[PDB]
Coordinates of C-alpha atoms in Angstrom, one line a residue:
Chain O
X1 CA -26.2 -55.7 -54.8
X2 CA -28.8 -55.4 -52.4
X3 CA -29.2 -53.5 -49.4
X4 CA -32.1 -54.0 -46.4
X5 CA -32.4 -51.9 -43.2
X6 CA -28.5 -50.8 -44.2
X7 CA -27.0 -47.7 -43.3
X8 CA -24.4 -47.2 -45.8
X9 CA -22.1 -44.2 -45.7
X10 CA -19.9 -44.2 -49.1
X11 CA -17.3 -41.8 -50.3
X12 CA -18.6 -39.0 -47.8
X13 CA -16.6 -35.8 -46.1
X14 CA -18.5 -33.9 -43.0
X15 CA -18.0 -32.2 -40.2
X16 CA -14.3 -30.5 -41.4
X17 CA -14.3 -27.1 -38.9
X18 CA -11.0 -24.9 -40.0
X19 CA -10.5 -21.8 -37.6
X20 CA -7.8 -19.6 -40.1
X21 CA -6.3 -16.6 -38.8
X22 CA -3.4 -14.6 -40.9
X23 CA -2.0 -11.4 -40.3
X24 CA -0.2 -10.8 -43.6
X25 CA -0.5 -13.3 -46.7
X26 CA 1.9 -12.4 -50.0
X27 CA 1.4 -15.3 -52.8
X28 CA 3.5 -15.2 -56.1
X29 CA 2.4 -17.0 -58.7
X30 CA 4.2 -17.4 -62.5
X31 CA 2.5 -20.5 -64.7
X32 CA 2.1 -22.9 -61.3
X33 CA -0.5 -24.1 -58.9
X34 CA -1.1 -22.5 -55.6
X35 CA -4.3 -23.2 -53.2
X36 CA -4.3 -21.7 -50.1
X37 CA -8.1 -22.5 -48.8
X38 CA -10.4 -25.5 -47.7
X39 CA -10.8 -28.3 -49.9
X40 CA -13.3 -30.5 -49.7
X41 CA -14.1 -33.5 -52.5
X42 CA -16.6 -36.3 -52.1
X43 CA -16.9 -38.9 -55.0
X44 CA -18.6 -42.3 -55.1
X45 CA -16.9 -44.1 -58.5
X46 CA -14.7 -42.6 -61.3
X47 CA -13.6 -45.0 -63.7
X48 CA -11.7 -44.2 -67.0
X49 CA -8.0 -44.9 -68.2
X50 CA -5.6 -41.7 -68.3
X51 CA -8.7 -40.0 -66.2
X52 CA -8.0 -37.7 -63.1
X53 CA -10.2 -37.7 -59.9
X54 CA -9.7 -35.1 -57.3
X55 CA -6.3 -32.9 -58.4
X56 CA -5.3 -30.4 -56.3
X57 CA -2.7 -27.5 -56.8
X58 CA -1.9 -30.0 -60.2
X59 CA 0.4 -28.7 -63.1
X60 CA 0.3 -31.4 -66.1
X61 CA 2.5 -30.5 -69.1
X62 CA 2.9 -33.7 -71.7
X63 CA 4.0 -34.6 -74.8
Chain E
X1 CA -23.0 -58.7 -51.9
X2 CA -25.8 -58.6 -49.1
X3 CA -26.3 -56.1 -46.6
X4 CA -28.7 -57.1 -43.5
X5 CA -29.4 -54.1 -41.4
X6 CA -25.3 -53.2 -41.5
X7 CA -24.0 -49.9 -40.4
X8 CA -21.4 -49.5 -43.4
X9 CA -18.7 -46.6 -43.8
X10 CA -16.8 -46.8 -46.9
X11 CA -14.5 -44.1 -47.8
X12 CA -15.4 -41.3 -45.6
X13 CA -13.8 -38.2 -44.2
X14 CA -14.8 -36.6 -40.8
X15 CA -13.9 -35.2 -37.6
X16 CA -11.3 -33.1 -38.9
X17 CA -10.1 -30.0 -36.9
X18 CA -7.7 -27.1 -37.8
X19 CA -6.6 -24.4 -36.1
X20 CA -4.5 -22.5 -37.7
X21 CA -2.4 -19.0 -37.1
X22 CA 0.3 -17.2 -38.9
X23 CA 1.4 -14.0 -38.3
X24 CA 3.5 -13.9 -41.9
X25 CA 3.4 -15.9 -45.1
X26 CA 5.3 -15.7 -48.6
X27 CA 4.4 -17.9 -51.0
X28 CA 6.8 -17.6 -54.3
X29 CA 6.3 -20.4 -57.1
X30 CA 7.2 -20.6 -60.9
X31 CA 5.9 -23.5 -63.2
X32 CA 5.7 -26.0 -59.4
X33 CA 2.3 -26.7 -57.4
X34 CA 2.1 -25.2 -53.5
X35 CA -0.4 -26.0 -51.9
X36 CA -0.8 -24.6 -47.8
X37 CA -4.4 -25.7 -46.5
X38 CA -6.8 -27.9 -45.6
X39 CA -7.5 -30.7 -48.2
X40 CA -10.0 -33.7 -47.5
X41 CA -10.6 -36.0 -50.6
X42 CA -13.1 -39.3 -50.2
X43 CA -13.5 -42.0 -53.1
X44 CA -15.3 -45.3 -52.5
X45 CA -13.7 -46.4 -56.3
X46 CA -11.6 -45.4 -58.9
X47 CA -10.6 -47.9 -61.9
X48 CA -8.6 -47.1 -65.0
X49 CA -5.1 -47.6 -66.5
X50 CA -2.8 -45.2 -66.1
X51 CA -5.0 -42.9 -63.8
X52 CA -4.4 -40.6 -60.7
X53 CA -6.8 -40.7 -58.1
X54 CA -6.2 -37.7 -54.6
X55 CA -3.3 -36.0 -56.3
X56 CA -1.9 -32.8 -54.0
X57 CA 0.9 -30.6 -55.2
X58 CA 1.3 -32.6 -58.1
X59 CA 4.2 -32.0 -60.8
X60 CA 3.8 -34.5 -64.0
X61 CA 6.3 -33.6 -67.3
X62 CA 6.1 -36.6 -69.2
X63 CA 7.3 -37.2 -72.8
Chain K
X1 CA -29.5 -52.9 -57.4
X2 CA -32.0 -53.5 -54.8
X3 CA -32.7 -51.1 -52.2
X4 CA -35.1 -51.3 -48.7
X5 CA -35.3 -49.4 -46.2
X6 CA -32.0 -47.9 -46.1
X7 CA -30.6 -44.6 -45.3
X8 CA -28.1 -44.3 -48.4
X9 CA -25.7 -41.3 -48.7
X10 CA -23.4 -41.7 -51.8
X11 CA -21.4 -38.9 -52.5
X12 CA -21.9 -36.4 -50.4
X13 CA -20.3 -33.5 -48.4
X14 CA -22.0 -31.6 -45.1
X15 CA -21.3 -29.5 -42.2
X16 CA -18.1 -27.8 -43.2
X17 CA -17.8 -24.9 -41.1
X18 CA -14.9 -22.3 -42.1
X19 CA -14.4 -19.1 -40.0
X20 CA -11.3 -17.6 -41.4
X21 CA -9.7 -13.7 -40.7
X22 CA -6.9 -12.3 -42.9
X23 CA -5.9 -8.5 -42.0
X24 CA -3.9 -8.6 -45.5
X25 CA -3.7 -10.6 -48.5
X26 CA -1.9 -9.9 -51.5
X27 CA -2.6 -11.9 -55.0
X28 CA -0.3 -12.1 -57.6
X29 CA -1.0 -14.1 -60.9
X30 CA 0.9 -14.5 -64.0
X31 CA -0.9 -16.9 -66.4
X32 CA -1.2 -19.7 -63.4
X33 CA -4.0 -20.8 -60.8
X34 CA -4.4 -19.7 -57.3
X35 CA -7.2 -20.5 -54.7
X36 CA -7.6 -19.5 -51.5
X37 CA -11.6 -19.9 -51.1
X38 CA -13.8 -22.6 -49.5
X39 CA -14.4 -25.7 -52.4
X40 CA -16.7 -28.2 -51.9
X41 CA -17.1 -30.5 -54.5
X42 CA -20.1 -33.7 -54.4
X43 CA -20.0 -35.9 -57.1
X44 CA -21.4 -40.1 -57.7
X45 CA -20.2 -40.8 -61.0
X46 CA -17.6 -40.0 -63.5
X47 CA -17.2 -41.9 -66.6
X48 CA -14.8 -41.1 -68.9
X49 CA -11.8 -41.9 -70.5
X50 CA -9.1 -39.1 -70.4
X51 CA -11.5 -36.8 -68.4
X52 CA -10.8 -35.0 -65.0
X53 CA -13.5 -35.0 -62.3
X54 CA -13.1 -32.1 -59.5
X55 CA -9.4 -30.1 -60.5
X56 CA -9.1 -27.1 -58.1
X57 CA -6.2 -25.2 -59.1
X58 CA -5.1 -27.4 -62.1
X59 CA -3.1 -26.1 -64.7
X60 CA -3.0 -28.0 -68.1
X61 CA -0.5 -27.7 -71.2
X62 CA -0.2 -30.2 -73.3
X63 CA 0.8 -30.9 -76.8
Chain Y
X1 CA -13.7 -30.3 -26.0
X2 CA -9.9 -28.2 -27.0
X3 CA -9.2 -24.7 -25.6
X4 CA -7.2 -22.5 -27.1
X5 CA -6.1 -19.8 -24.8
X6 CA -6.0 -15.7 -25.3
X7 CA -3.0 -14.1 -27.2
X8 CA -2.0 -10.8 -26.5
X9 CA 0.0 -7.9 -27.6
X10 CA 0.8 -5.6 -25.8
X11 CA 3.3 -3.0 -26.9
X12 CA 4.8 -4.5 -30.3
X13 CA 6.2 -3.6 -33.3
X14 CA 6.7 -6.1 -36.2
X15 CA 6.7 -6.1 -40.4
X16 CA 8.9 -3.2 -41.1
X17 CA 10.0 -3.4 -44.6
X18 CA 12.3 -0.6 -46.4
X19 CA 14.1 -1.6 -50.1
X20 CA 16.6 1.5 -51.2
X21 CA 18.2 1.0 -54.5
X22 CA 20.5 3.6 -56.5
X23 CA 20.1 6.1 -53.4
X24 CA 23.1 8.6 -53.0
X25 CA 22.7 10.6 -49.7
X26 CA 25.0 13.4 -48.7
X27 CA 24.4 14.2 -45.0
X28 CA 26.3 17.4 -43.4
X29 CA 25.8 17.7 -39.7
X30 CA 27.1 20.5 -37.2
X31 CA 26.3 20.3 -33.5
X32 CA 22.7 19.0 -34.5
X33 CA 21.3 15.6 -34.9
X34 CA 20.4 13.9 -37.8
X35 CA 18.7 10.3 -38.7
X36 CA 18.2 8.8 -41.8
X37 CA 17.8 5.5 -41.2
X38 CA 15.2 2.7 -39.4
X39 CA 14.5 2.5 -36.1
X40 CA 11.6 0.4 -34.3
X41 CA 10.6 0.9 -30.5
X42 CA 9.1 -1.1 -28.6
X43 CA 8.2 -0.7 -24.4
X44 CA 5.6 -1.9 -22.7
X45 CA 6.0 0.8 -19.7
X46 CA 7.8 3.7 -18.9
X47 CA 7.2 5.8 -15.4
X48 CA 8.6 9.0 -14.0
X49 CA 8.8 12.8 -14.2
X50 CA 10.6 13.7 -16.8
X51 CA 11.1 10.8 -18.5
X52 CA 11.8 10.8 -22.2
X53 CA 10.5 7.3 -24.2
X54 CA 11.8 6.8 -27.2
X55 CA 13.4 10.0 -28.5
X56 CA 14.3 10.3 -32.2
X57 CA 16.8 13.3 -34.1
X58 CA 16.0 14.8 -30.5
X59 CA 18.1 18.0 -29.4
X60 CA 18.2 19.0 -26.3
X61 CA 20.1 22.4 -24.8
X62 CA 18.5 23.9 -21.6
X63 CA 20.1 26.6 -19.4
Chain I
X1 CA -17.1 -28.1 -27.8
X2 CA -14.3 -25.4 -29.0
X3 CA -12.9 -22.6 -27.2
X4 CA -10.4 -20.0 -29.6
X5 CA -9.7 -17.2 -26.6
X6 CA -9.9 -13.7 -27.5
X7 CA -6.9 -11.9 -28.7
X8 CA -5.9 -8.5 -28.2
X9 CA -3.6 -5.5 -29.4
X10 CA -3.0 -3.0 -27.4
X11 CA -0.6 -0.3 -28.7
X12 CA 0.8 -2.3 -31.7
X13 CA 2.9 -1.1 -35.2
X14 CA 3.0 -3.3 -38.0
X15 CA 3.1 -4.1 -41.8
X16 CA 5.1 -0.6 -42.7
X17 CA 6.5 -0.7 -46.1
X18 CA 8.8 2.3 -47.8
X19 CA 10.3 1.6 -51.3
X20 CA 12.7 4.0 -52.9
X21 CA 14.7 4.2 -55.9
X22 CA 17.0 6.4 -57.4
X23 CA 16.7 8.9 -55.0
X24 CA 19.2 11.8 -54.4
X25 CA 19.0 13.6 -51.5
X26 CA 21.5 16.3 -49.6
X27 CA 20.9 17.2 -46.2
X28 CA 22.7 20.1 -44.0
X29 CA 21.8 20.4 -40.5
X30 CA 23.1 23.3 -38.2
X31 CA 22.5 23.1 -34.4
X32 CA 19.1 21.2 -35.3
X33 CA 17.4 18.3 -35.4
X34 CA 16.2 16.2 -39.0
X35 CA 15.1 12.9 -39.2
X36 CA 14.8 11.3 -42.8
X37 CA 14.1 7.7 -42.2
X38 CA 11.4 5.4 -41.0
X39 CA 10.4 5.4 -37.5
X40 CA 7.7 3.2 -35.4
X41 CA 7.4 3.4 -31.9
X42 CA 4.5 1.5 -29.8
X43 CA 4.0 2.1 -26.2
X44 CA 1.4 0.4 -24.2
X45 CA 1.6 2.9 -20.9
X46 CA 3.7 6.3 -20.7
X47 CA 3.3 7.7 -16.9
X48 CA 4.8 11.0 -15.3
X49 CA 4.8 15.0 -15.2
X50 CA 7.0 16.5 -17.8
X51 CA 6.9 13.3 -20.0
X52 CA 7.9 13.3 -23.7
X53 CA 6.3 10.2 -25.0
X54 CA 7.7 9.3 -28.6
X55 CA 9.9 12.7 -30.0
X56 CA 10.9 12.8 -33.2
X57 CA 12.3 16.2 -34.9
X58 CA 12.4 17.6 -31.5
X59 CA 14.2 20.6 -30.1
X60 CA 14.3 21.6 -26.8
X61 CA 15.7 25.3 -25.5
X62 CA 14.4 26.1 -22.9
X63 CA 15.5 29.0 -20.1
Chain U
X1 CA -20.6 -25.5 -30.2
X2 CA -17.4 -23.3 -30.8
X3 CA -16.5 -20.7 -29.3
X4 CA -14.7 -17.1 -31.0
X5 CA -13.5 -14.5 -28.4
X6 CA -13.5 -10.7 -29.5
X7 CA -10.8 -9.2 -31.0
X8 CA -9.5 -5.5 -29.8
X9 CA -7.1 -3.3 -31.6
X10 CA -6.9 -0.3 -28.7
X11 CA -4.1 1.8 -30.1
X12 CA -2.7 0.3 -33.2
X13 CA -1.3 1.6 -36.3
X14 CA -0.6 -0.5 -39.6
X15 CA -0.3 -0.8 -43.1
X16 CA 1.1 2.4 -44.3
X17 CA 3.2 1.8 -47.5
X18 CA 5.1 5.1 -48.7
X19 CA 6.3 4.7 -52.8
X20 CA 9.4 6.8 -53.7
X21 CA 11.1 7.1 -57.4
X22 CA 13.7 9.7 -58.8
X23 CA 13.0 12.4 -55.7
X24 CA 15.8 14.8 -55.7
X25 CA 15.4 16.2 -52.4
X26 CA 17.7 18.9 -50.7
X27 CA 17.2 20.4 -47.1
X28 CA 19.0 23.2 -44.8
X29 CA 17.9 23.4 -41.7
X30 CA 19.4 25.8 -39.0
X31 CA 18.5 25.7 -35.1
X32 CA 14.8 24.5 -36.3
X33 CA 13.3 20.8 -36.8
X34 CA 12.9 19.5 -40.0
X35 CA 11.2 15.6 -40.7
X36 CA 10.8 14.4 -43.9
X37 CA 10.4 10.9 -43.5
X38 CA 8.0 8.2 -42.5
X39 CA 6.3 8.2 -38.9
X40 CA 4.2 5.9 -37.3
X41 CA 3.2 6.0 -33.2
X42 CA 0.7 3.7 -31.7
X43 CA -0.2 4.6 -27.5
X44 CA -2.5 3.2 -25.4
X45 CA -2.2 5.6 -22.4
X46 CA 0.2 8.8 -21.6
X47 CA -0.6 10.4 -18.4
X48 CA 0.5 13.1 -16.6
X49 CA 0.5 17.1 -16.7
X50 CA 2.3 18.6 -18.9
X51 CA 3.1 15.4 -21.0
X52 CA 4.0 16.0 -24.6
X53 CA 2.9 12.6 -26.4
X54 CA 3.8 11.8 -30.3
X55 CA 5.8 15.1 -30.5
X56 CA 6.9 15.0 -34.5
X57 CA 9.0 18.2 -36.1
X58 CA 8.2 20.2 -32.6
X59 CA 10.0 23.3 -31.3
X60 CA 10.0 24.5 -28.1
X61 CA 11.7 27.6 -26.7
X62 CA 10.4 29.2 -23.7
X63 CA 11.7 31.5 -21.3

């Protein structure tokens, strides 16, 4: 690797303008996932086996 | 790899506008994954076996 | 790695502008995960095997 | 540039929630008037002498 | 450049809840009026001598 | 830039919740005005002499 003058951008999240507006909001919930808002997740590398990078409203239940 | 003065952009997120607007909203959930809003994920790499990389409502019940 | 010169931005999250309005908002949680704020999350590296880089609203049970 | 024009509302009515459950009512009316349930009006304008707008359990006996 | 317009409410009802449960209730009305129940009335303008605007439980004898 | 107009809420009326659980309730009315439930008025304007706005469990006997 070797970079000169370069202008590199990786694994980058900008300019993300949300305009919410909600009169009435009811969320039930029992044991699950909810999301409801702004997410936002920047990551360059993530290496691993079985890993997770960047879950979300995730339910894992295994064996 | 080499970079001469290059304007790279790898794995980026921008530019992203919501406007949102609701008068009403009923979210009911038991054991599942909801999710209702804005989400912006941005990897330049993800290496492994078996891995999940940018889940979103995500549901795994393995054995 | 070599760098010279250049304007590098690995990993990174900016300008995330939110202007939200909720007249009502009713939460209710019964051993699960709910979120309904702003999340910003900025990371280079994850190593790991079986880890979990940036959950938001995970749920885990395993056995 | 994205416009997003003016709502309005003028003279609404909305979100009227009524649950009732094992209720016994005994209702006995001579000559009068009686309500016992729901009711929701909505006018934008009403003009006039002697106008009546949205009357409810009214009685009326003039000579 | 993003324009959201300005909103407005005039002479709105909303979000109007009523629970009940095991409720007994007798009512006996002679030559008047009784209301019992949920009302909601919005009006943006009401115009005129003499006007009755929104009655409810009203009774009127006049000579 | 981005814009937000201004909100207004000129005669409104919300979120009025009302509970209710083993009420034994019993009424006689005679010739008079009897209320006993939930109300909820929202005007912007009511013009005019003599004008009777939002009236609730009134009598009125003249001569």
């Amino acid at each position: 690797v070797l970079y000169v003058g370069s202008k590199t951008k990786e694994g980058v999240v900008h300019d993300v303008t949300t305009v919410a507006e909600k009169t009435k909001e009811q969320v039930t919930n029992v044991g699950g996932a909810v999301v409801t808002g702004v997410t936002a997740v920047a990551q360059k590398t993530v290496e691993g086996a079985g890993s997770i990078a960047a879950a979300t409203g995730f339910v894992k239940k295994d064996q």
